[PDB]
Design a protein around this ligand. Structure first.
Ligand SMILES: [Fe+3]
Ligand SMILES: [Mg+2]
Ligand SMILES: [Mg+2]
Ligand SMILES: [Mg+2]
Lengths: 197, 212
């Protein structure tokens, strides 16, 4: 009849899994709390923003980031789980890049942060590969006719970040000022960096 | 596995539930949500009981209606629990007793997997390749939209990894292969029914063959 199976509340199931393993000595002291702290406080799109601001103000670094993203990210010490082989993809006046994991949710965790609910949604996983212009427009980003959209589907171990175009009106800004307008959505590729008015 | 998780190109979904730069809230929206990834890492890195690939495949093995109605992090609670039962570490009885109620798991695998292919080709940037027209009932990191399609190599990785169709089943014969960024024209994948430009899929060597 297509009905859902009976299930205990998800909180009860998740803590049951913890307790079953912990009670057998298989979970080191502090282990899951340590991972929660890493996920919440260390893996962060502020890191990808720092890399973008550096590439925008340092041609040499920009070239390394686009040719050997792993090496560039390692200079900052930001390699990590789900972020060991990095490729940065460059937006240009004729090309807009967008990232997805259509099969699940794969994301460059250490430099983008853990993916948000919308990126893991069936709507984004199904639609952005086939109609990325319409998806971005609905999300609030208009990509003109004149620009190729290229969708990177994260299907193996490459973990991607978008290097967005640097917007007019930011000439001479410091790296801190530039970092501030590079958001998580800019790194995923669904947003373009915005300059206040 | 041609499961419901292979969602790219499915039609009928509505709007993505986000507008750009909207507040996404905290990393975890419930106090249990850090547990699936943390316990997965216990399994992978502290116990050596399973690979990340096995986690992807056990989630793919959720019964299809169950998958479609289950929020993301809960799918990984169910997947990690399932692997711990299948590996002999935990029992479903103890999980249900601790949980105070039903804890249905993913379905058993219907494939033993397959080894890393013995015959493959090293491709170079700019070469045209076709995705092998093959059907794999176990784990595979090839979305169906690119099966049999032709594209161009934009990158060969400088590292190699175990073949998912083997290591996602815990087999000993996953070997190692590089992967290739293969660029497809949108029209190659979806004909006239697309508004995009190109799609780049990151495909293991063993999924590819020379085109024509
Ligand atoms: Fe994923
Ligand atoms: Mg299918
Ligand atoms: Mg529910
Ligand atoms: Mg029973």
């Amino acid at each position: 009849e297509n009905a859902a199976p009976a299930q205990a509340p998800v909180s009860d199931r998740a803590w049951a899994l913890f307790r079953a393993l912990d009670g057998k000595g298989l979970v080191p002291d502090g282990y899951v709390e340590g991972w929660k702290k890493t996920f919440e406080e260390d893996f962060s799109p502020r890191r990808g923003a720092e890399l973008v601001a550096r590439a925008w103000t340092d041609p040499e670094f920009r070239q390394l980031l686009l040719t050997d993203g792993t090496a560039a990210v390692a200079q900052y010490g930001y390699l990590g789980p789900q972020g060991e082989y990095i490729v940065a993809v460059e937006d240009t006046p004729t090309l807009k890049n967008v990232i997805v994991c259509s099969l699940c949710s794969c994301t460059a965790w250490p430099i983008l942060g853990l993916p948000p609910t919308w990126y893991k949604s069936f709507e984004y996983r199904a639609r952005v590969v086939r109609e990325p212009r319409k998806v971005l427009s609905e999300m609030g980003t208009e990509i003109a006719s004149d620009i190729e959209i290229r969708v990177y589907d994260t299907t193996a171990e490459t973990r991607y970040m978008v290097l967005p175009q640097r917007p007019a009106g930011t000439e001479g800004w410091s790296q801190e000022q530039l970092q501030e307008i590079v958001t998580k959505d800019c790194l995923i590729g669904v947003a373009i960096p915005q300059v206040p008015t | 596995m041609d499961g419901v998780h292979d969602l790219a190109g499915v039609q009928g979904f509505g709007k993505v539930p986000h507008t750009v730069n909207a507040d996404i809230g905290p990393t975890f929206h419930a106090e249990w949500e850090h547990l699936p990834y943390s316990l997965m890492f216990a399994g992978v890195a502290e116990l050596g009981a399973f690979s990340v690939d096995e986690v992807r495949y056990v989630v793919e093995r959720m019964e299809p209606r169950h998958y479609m109605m289950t929020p993301f992090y809960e799918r990984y609670v169910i997947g990690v629990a399932t692997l711990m039962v299948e590996k002999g570490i935990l029992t479903q009885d103890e999980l249900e007793s601790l949980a105070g109620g039903p804890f249905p798991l993913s379905r058993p695998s219907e494939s033993e997997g397959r080894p890393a292919p013995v015959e493959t080709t090293t491709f170079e940037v700019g070469q045209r390749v076709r995705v092998r027209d093959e059907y794999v009932p176990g784990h595979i990191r090839m979305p169906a939209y690119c099966r049999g399609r032709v594209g161009t190599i934009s990158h060969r990785t400088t590292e190699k990894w175990p073949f998912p169709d083997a290591i996602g089943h815990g087999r000993n014969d996953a070997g190692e292969e590089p992967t290739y960024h293969v660029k497809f024209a949108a029209e190659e994948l979806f004909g006239s029914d697309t508004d995009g430009g190109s799609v780049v899929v990151d495909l293991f060597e063993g999924y590819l063959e020379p085109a024509a």
